[PDB]
Design a protein around this ligand. Sequence first.
Ligand code: NI
Length: 519
Amino acid sequence: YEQDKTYKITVLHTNDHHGHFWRNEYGEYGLAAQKTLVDGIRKEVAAEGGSVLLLSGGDINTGVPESDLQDAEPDFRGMNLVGYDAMAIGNHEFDNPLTVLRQQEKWAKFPLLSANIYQKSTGERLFKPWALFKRQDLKIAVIGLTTDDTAKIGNPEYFTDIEFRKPADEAKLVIQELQQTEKPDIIIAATHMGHYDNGEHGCNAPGDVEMARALPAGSLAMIVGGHSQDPVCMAAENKKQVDYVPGTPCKPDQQNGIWIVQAHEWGKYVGRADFEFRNGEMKMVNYQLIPVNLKKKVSERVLYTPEIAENQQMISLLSPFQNKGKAQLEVKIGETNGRLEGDRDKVRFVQTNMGRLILAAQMDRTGADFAVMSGGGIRDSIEAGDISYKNVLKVQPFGNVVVYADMTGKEVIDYLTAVAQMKPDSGAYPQFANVSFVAKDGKLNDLKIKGEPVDPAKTYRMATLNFNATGGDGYPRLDNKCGYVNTGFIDAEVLKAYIQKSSPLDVSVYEPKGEVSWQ
Ligand code: NI
């Protein structure tokens, strides 16, 4: 690269887009606003003779019905118009068969990268490990890495002849081969692994911090991350800000001479790392997270930072997808031969069939042995007859995320005991599935899971919602348990997909028969 010259690289990034091609109902984010933002940063940087690179940390799939229903086609096409250069493959890129992921690679005009995803039968990579970019006469390599938790999480589906090797180990190999064969001026890793304070990954697969620490110092300029779904803005050494506020300064993490960034989720921000490159080394000049029309409830909603207009061309591209998405919510996904009871004065007093249907859906998605939610979370009934996604969204309107915890029998006893204290005639009244007992005097008698007494030596998987897992309605906190996993699947999508594949539903199968009682 021509010697003793300082060059200017700006790296933009997003991650964990999760189907948010369209603005939300308050005019926040969406790719049309993202397009305007990125186009302006491009024009600015090009007027200063610098270079731009736009990377995604992945998880483009899964999270919004109008996207999910169309296999994220709008999202990938919109990304083409924004002009992404590359993305790392996320675990949610495996929510669909490989057919669909291969199809997303066709739609995408940028490479979907992952070095550590291998075909079992051949020992060969399924995807490109990296991509090379020429910015001016700089040679820049972007490697992709995917969390090796991908196939371990929930009830895994589409991993036929595939495996996920340790990304940290793959990174070593891949960096070494690149330096040897290409001598990139800059290597960046787009990853889908997660940021954990001080590398405290708990029972999750090690993520970016740990990888950064294990690599030779400064051997990557930066890691552009995702999966954990945080704004990586450090309040203190090895401690991210809690409740990071849009439009305030964001200090990215630096670990063993490698900058680690993450732009939260859903296109909420476009992150901007301005670097200067001289003599093979990279210096970070500035870092920020630019909100994409984020708003705070103050009752109305107000911008944090200047309004970014929606690119007209992105609106014309995406609208037909939006509109086709909405229409498809009206279509029959299934049928039931009986009324599923979701009325407030039932679901907050007794176990109902809708409770069991939802919880069945959540167990099925997670591989759980049992499940709980609060009655205040079932928000409508579905009448006998045909069922649409629009019906499911009335029943599950708050967009809670399905999660699970692996717990000892003893932790099961204590959790259920505590939950059993919640009283009828409140939203905190619990719906259970695969649980039986008679509560007497704050104590559970004959406690069983799936017909069997709870063995404190065994591990049980429980499904519920993030809302309850984080202490909603005074439920015991699970989000700090080693073994807690937020799956990222939305309650309503999980209920709809279960209804669709299970239909026609025979509701009798969801009828409680006195498994739980209080005296
Ligand atoms: Ni992920």
